Design a protein around this nucleic acid. Structure first.
Ligand SMILES: Nc1nc2c(ncn2[C@@H]2O[C@H](COP(=O)(O)OP(=O)(O)OP(=O)(O)O)[C@@H](O)[C@H]2O)c(=O)[nH]1
Ligand SMILES: O=c1ccn([C@@H]2O[C@H](COP(=O)(O)OP(=O)(O)OP(=O)(O)O)[C@@H](O)[C@H]2O)c(=O)[nH]1
Lengths: 1082, 394, 15, 50, 99, 49, 99
RNA sequence: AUAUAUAUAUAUAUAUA
RNA sequence: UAUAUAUAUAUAUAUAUA
């Protein structure tokens, strides 16, 4: 393996002492080689206990090194002091960067010394600069200095990659060495006593700078990383938006030669149309003012790149312009104070001189859309609106509530804020009213939360009480169903692939058509959202209170009206210093259940009005209006060909007419491409944002290092597929430090390639990128059962809370409200849902995961001896694999590439077998009980509970079905027709299609039903054993791509799988689960 | 606007090609109609509102009685039913007819659905347009699989290069009337050369514009599903008596697809100005026969019709190329005639035809030799020079 | 600055 | 379809005594429920009277 | 004038453009504001007082802008419009509503 | 066609604001076809009716 | 498909509904007697007690229409389905017998 | 002695005295 | 002489988006 070779040179770099030793640990599937592994590991612990070498021992036990596989590498290091600064002065050659002070409009966001920015010790909030990743700066500088000594002696091409990653390191190292490397605590939080003399934003600058200089490959990358590393030391605020500004304009200049398209039922076609790009002179005057704001900010090598591209305006050099936009978001987050983020957001200027003739049409268009979404589930009395108190409470999001409450659960009292834990307390103390929702007014205001965006100003968010979730769950779950059957709302075009969903932009683009994409400056706190948006919905629930006749569908529709009356005036609770500031804010509340289902109504019903007022001058015929919250486009098809004046006079008539409703906007029109989400259609080729901060998190999580090392790799493979190539030798160096564990003092344990890359709970990174590899060899399926044996752990906090008198009083009050019977297969099935729902609490899931890893250390310091006969996914593929016969085969390049930023070893698969044409849905069949229970009751049972029901008596299935609420003639038509007997073979087959994934980070892009992959896969057909047929044609279609990515060549399989081995595998596929299947092997 | 009395315009000389570049110039006609195949491909309007292929394969499995999943490589009936290859077959059937670029079928013999839906190409597109080494291997594969196992006769003893196509033989060797009335239309389907409005363009038959030729086909292959198949087993019958009934159930949509192609080919035919000629080209633009199956049973109820700002652009580029072609003949014959009449015996005219192949934007100089460039001068030397250039050299 | 459209240039020879 | 809530308790305490399970005499189909029989009986009568 | 919130809800429920057989385009009711009815009163008198030839402009895929074209031709005298648009509105009415 | 009574009353107005504005016309009202045409939208005529 | 006839070309907007055009094209007697009742099933506008209300046909209140349908749904199940395959015949004859 | 809303896709993991 | 029917399991974490 390649990763093990990077391990044994990382140890020889960080521990350059003669007192240091490395002890490899080995394991094997053989019972004979295991005793070869026990004796070898014992002797290296006795010989290295008292100063004896290992070169005389590795020859004697060379029967175990070349045959068994590496488990871990133990590290002895009697080094008292970290030698980071001792080898930092070797690279600290350049002049130190002096910070600037006149570049920011605030004081704390400037780059001042922390002694001058915070006067005393007690008012030191690190939450403006905190990287909140579980690594350090001292560990990052060892990850670059390891790379800068391995690639010192290089060939004449790879030297220039090393040289450009060195002059960008002397900018970093000569600034850090001037103030010294900061020393963190054990929680990876930079304290005040170390940051007394260091400049503020030195950790989050040098973390965002090291992420950049491990991505500098070409000279086009070096001019960007030289003018962003120097500048991000000075202005932390304006820099991320000045560079990322013209990419909203530059998407409208490129021509269309041959573009993709998606037809009406969402499937992919290819089109060949040639559409000119028509931009007026007021775009090249708005682009020159976007290139003079980048010259006053100091940077001068970026607008020379753009102005050398504006004379071309060609799609061949647009991968350079998408690279400049993506490097802008890597400067780090824009975190600021909670007071200045709200008070700059909650400040808005309303005006009584707004056009009231346009609001009474905008209110009515919200009225006629809310009625249109609920006219069918209210006229027919639906099973989910009649149970709004229960379906909102039984499926309750457990993220957070407003305040911190002292919850007492039996003996163990806990300070929690989770939302379903507040429901358990108030249902125990009786202070929980089902039909009364609390008023958010000048008394009891709304608390606040924040979300940080890598380039945007820090925004606020609203945390409503839990009684504003039970009132709004059942109605808005009926509005998301209509948003998946309408061509306008963007819950419809939401699939796995991105060419299918955002490819209806280029359906109506021609030379007589004009696309129109507008982004409101702030969708919250607009004038058209305070009064005319609530009173359009309250009117829609007056016409819906006349549609039905129940006392219970009206009552849930008089609660969803009461939450809009109470939010017409609102107050936010934000503290500062010692005073609490209550700010009136009657606008929309980003943070309800309603905040996306009613940002697609209020923005469609707004743009259906502003497209009506511009039709007094230009007569057109609109084709689609797709809307996604704020971000919406609307294609307009004209009579004449679109010229340079119809583009200018529509962009002046959509901007001004939006200003007639006091909504400040910029209105951009083009004919070639838009920027709807961060996914950019440019010239018929979808381009992505590609900015994910590796070494900077927006907030500290509920996860450990072994899980934050997986999201460092998962944020890299998304960064690589989207066009931002970070060096794999740096990501692998950063996994060998995060997965480090200190057993005792001066002893670190490092797992090998087989512990991290195997398919289990403890997975960090794949061996070769973009592909999953299920290792079918006997030394690798044997360790998968060793890791699948300890994943089932119990946490003592979740079992002290599950046996309390409060949690049992919540399940028994929820089981009594649901079922009007006695049965305990639901009370034992509801209580297993809220025990699973309490994993969102932080010390519960941390004591789950720490009991996973601390039990892994007992497995890694010794050779593994755990032998078990469990059927895994990796045991199915050991029986299929010897019956494949490979043969080399040639396959031409037919289809066109649609994403130019993809890597070369992925783009060659797309050019040969094609991008995905349609989203494959092969999930078998749902059982006939779950179509009978989910249609009457709102209780969705797990499929391991519906198998437990079927294996009961005939008279105990009928008692269970009548228990939920099913009538007697419907259960007796179920049970009497013996279709409970057929559902044994549809539950057990539902775990086969769940098993293997045709979607991944990379596998979504390809077409798996292509007529060029079906030509290479040559498998003979057997009529029976249907479960085996699926897993043969899926594993064969995955084995060719997993070979054609690694080596760039195509192979053609042949699986003459015999009839005697299919029936042995048919019972292996039905015995993965832990339930009684009728057909077993032995 | 209504233009005043003192407005003038420059009329471009659009008169049909005077070199006859389709006659013995086999390599220059390969890339002068590749150029008109790509341009017509970017104009022919693309199919929106197709039947979704998840809701069409899963109905094609309930009908063929196959346990065939969505991901199983079902190479007998269900391979390659995409939607990218549904718009593609619509485009390379319309734009190959507008440029007279001869196709070349590519298929697999053991895929019985691509032979059922392959019976629809030959009854719509005239068979003088598929290449003959791939028309014969597709007409023979239909005969020895679907038609000759229907009436139980011996499979066809066809040899290579026999000057009769295998549909031209099996209308004499067959005894039925409904499948020798359709099989006579396929052997006698040809473009009809009519000179309309100054240009020669090749209209279809009137029974292909109506869609009535499908009513000669779904009356033929309805009777073919009533035969007993005596020499074949029970399973070979019920495999392809079920496969030929997937197409006879789409008789409503295939009589609307033949009207769509023959109308989308009519209005795009009006926007061309160069004299289109039906001469077999060298390099053939390949049509996968799987893509015809993706067109015959994936379309429904949604008329596409080319919006007239792609007719006014396909016309304004066939005037700009045809008037750049003609005013580079006249700039070159005026030098060849004025060099021979001035008695320049010591000058060779390779360079002034090398400019003529260069000002025409589509050709390349590094491919044409000095024998396809002096043979071209021998045609230019015999043309009469333009009157504005003759009265100024005289 | 891009080349002007043929429609906007030929209302300008008129105007 | 319709009966009171306590009759479900009144029919559960004697269901194990009097085994009447296929008295309803119907072949089941997927997509058949009794809440749509009660619904289609009401949208056939009330769409005729109005 | 008649309020815009009233006439649109009677015009978008009598036409019912959303529930039509065609779904290749998003169809809604456009241009029934109170600024175009105040602008067609200014244009249709001032282009009639000063003898300036009006010209029509529409999209023919909707018929509610074409049915009201019948009122325009019966009041404004037909020699006012430029003839290649008077033809292309009278032919547009005939080939989709009258014939 | 149901809006008849308020549309007899529009052309009585459209031909009265023409009729008494034409009395303030001293220049000769010659009628010939002009080059540039003031464009009228039929989507703005379906608002006046 | 039960009688083996060719499936009908029914264009959009034909004035004859496809039961009123398949009682003329079909040659049976019992399934052409049910298709005559569906083509002439109408409300009977009578005034009763001063209130005009639309009573149903007298055979529908009796129940005798089902004995006209199930007499026609039985002859259609004893047919051979000549064009279609046998499993399509087994898919209707299993479902037409549940009724 | 300890703060992180809602929705949509996607992936990983899990159910047992 | 004969080879069955049917499209939205749940929970937490993670990233992309609004
Ligand atoms: N001790 C310790 N080592 C870390 C930590 N994070 C990373 N390291 C590793 O330790 C090296 C840097 O030395 P230190 O951070 O001082 O760790 P140390 O050598 O054990 O010395 P001490 O921290 O004083 O215990 C880096 O190369 C990392 O591989 C940490 O949080 N604590
Ligand atoms: O975490 C989030 C993000 C967004 N939203 C909802 O999405 C809406 C649109 O999100 P945008 O990011 O488009 O808002 P914006 O227009 O204010 O952005 P800038 O121009 O200032 O860059 C927001 O106004 C809010 O309603 C949330 O509810 N939660």
């Amino acid at each position: 393996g390649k990763y093990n070779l990077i391990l044994s040179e990382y140890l020889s770099f960080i521990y350059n002492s003669q007192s240091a030793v490395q002890i490899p640990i080995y394991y094997s599937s053989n019972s004979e080689l295991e005793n070869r592994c026990i004796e070898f590991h014992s002797k290296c612990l006795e010989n290295s206990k008292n100063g004896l070498s290992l070169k005389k021992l590795f020859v004697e036990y060379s029967d175990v090194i070349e045959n068994a596989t590496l488990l871990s590498i133990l590290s002895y290091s009697y080094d008292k002091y970290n030698a980071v600064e001792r080898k930092l002065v070797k690279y600290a050659k350049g002049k130190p960067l002096e910070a600037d002070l006149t570049v920011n409009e605030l004081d704390y966001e400037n780059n001042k010394i922390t002694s001058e920015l915070f006067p005393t010790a007690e008012e030191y909030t690190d939450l403006l600069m905190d990287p909140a990743i579980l690594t350090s700066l001292s560990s990052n500088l060892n990850a670059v200095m390891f790379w800068l000594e391995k690639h010192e002696n290089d060939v004449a091409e790879k030297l220039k990659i090393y040289k450009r990653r060195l002059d960008l390191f002397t900018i970093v190292a000569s600034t850090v060495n001037k103030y010294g490397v900061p020393r963190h605590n054990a929680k990876y939080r930079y304290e005040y006593e170390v940051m007394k003399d260091k400049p503020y934003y030195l950790v989050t600058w040098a973390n965002s700078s090291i992420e950049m200089l491990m991505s500098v490959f070409s000279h086009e990358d070096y001019l960007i990383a030289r003018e962003l590393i120097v500048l991000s030391y000075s202005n932390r605020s304006t820099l991320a938006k000045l560079v990322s500004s013209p990419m909203s304009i530059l998407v409208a200049l490129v021509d269309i030669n041959g573009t993709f398209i998606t037809n009406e039922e969402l499937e992919l076609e290819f089109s060949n149309k040639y559409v000119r790009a028509i931009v007026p002179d007021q775009t090249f005057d708005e682009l020159k003012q976007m290139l003079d704001n980048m010259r006053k900010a100091g940077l001068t090598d970026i607008p020379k790149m753009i102005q050398d591209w504006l004379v071309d305006c060609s799609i061949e050099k647009f991968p350079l312009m998408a690279k400049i936009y993506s490097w802008s978001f890597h400067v780090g987050f824009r975190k600021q104070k909670m007071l200045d983020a709200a008070l700059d957001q909650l400040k808005t200027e309303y005006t009584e001189d707004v056009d009231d003739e346009m609001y009474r049409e905008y209110t009515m268009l919200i009225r006629d859309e809310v009625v249109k979404m609920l006219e069918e589930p209210v006229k027919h009395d639906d099973h989910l609106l009649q149970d709004s108190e229960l379906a909102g409470l039984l499926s309750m999001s457990s993220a957070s509530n407003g305040e911190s409450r002292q919850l007492k659960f039996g003996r163990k009292t806990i300070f929690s804020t989770k939302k379903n834990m507040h429901v358990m307390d108030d249902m125990a103390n009786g202070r929980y009213t089902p039909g009364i929702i609390p008023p958010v007014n000048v008394d009891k205001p709304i608390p606040l939360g924040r979300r940080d965006v890598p380039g945007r100003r820090t925004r606020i968010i609203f945390i409503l009480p839990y009684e504003y979730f039970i009132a709004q769950h059942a109605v808005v779950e009926k509005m998301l169903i209509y948003a998946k059957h309408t061509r306008e709302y963007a819950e419809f075009y939401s699939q796995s692939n991105q060419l299918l969903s955002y490819g209806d932009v280029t359906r109506f683009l021609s030379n007589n058509s004009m696309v129109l994409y507008t982004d409101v400056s702030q969708w919250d706190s607009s004038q058209h959202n305070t009064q005319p948006f609530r009173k359009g919905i309250i009117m829609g629930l007056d016409m819906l209170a006349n549609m039905t006749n129940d006392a219970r569908v009206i009552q849930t529709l008089n609660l969803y009206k009461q939450t809009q009356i109470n939010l017409m005036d609102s107050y936010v609770q934000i503290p500062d210093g010692n005073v609490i500031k209550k700010i009136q804010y009657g606008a929309v509340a980003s943070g309800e259940k309603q905040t996306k289902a009613a940002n697609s109504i209020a923005n469609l019903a707004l743009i259906k009005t502003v497209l009506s007022r511009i039709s007094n001058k230009y007569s057109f015929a609109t084709k689609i209006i797709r809307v996604d919250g704020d971000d919406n486009y609307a294609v307009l098809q004209f009579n004449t060909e679109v010229t340079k004046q119809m583009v200018q006079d529509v962009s002046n008539d959509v901007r001004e007419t939006y200003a007639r409703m006091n909504t400040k906007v910029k209105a951009l029109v083009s004919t070639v491409g838009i920027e709807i989400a961060k996914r950019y259609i440019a010239g018929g080729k979808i381009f992505f944002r590609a900015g994910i901060n590796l070494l900077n998190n927006e907030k500290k999580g509920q996860s450990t290092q072994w899980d934050q090392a997986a999201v460092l790799y998962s944020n890299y493979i998304v960064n690589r597929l989207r066009g931002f190539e970070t060096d794999r030798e740096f990501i692998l160096t950063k996994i060998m430090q995060m997965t480090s564990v200190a057993i005792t003092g001066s002893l670190r344990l490092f797992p090998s390639e087989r512990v991290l890359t195997t398919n289990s709970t403890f997975k960090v990174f794949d061996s070769e990128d973009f592909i999953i590899e299920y290792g079918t060899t006997d030394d690798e399926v044997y360790i998968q059962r060793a890791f699948m044996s300890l994943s089932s752990q119990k946490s003592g906090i979740a079992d002290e809370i599950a046996a309390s008198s409060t949690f049992k009083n919540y399940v028994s009050r929820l089981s009594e409200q649901l079922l009007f019977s006695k049965n305990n297969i639901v009370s034992r099935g509801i209580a297993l849902t809220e025990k699973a729902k309490l994993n969102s609490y932080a010390p519960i899931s941390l004591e789950k995961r720490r009991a996973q890893i601390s039990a892994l250390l007992t497995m890694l310091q010794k050779p593994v001896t755990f032998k078990s006969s469990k059927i895994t996914i990796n045991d199915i593929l050991r029986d299929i694999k010897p019956f494949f016969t490979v043969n080399e085969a040639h396959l031409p390049i037919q289809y066109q590439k649609f994403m130019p930023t993809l890597p070369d070893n992925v783009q060659y698969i797309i050019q040969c077998i094609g991008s995905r044409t349609y989203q494959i849905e092969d999930d078998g069949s749902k059982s006939a009980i779950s179509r009978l229970i989910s249609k009457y009751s709102v209780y969705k049972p797990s499929i391991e509970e519906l198998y437990k029901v079927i294996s009961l008596h005939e008279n105990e299935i009928q008692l269970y079905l009548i228990s939920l609420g099913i009538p007697k003639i419907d259960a007796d038509t179920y049970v009497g027709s013996k279709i409970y007997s057929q559902d044994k073979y549809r539950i057990l087959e539902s775990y086969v299609y769940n098993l293997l994934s045709i979607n991944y980070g990379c596998y979504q892009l390809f077409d798996f039903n292509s007529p060029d992959l079906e030509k290479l896969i040559r498998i003979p057909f057997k009529g029976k054993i249907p479960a085996v047929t699926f897993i043969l044609h899926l594993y064969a279609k995955l084995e060719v791509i997993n070979h054609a990515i690694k080596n760039g060549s195509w192979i053609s399989l042949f699986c003459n799988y015999p009839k005697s081995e299919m029936i042995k595998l048919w019972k292996k596929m039905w015995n993965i689960t832990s339930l009684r299947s009728p057909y077993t092997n032995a | 606007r209504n233009l005043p009395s003192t407005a003038r315009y420059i009329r471009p000389n659009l008169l049909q090609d005077r070199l006859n570049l389709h006659d013995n110039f086999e390599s220059l006609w390969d890339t002068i109609t590749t150029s008109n195949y790509i341009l017509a491909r970017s104009v022919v309007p693309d199919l929106k509102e197709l039947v979704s292929t998840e809701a069409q394969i899963q109905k094609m499995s309930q009908d063929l009685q196959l346990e065939a999943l969505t991901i199983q490589s079902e190479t007998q009936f269900l391979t390659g039913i995409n939607s990218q290859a549904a718009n593609d077959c619509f485009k390379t059937l319309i734009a190959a007819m507008l440029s007279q670029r001869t196709m070349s079928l590519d298929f697999v013999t053991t895929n019985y659905m691509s032979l059922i839906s392959g019976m629809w190409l030959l009854t719509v597109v005239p068979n003088d347009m598929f290449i003959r080494e791939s028309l014969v291997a597709c007409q023979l594969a239909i005969i020895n699989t679907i038609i000759y196992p229907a009436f139980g006769m011996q499979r066809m003893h066809y040899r290579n290069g026999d000057p009769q196509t295998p549909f031209q033989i099996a209308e004499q060797q067959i005894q039925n009337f409904q499948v020798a009335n359709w099989l006579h239309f396929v052997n006698n389907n040809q473009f009809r050369q009519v000179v309309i409005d100054g240009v020669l363009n090749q209209v279809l038959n009137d029974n292909i514009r109506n869609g009535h030729v499908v009513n000669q086909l779904m009356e033929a292959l309805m009777q073919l599903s009533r035969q007993q198949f005596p020499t074949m087993p029970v399973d070979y019958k019920r495999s392809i008596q079920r496969g030929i009934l997937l197409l006879s159930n789409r008789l409503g949509q295939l009589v609307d697809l033949t009207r769509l192609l023959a109308y989308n080919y009519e209005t795009l035919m009006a926007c061309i100005t160069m004299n289109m000629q039906h001469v077999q080209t060298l390099t053939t633009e390949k049509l996968q026969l799987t893509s015809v199956t993706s067109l015959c049973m994936l379309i429904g109820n949604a008329t596409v019709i080319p919006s007239p700002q792609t007719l006014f652009h396909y016309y304004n580029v066939n005037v700009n190329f045809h008037s750049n072609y003609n005013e580079r003949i006249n700039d070159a014959v005026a030098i060849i005639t004025a060099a021979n009449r001035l008695n320049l015996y010591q000058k060779k005219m390779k360079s002034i035809v090398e400019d003529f192949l260069k000002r025409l934007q589509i050709f390349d100089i590094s491919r044409v030799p000095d024998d396809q460039m002096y043979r071209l001068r021998d045609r230019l030397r015999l043309l009469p020079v333009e009157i504005r250039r003759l009265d100024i050299f005289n | 600055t891009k080349e002007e459209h043929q429609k906007e240039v030929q209302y300008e020879i008129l105007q």
